[PDB]
Amino acid sequence: CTHXRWPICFPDGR
Structure with a gap:
């Protein structure tokens, strides 16, 4: 993020 x-x-975790 x-x-x-x-x-x-994002779906990843940022």
Whole structure:
């Protein structure tokens, strides 16, 4: 999972 610019979540766990 990203945080800051274009926050998104993946099925893997990031």
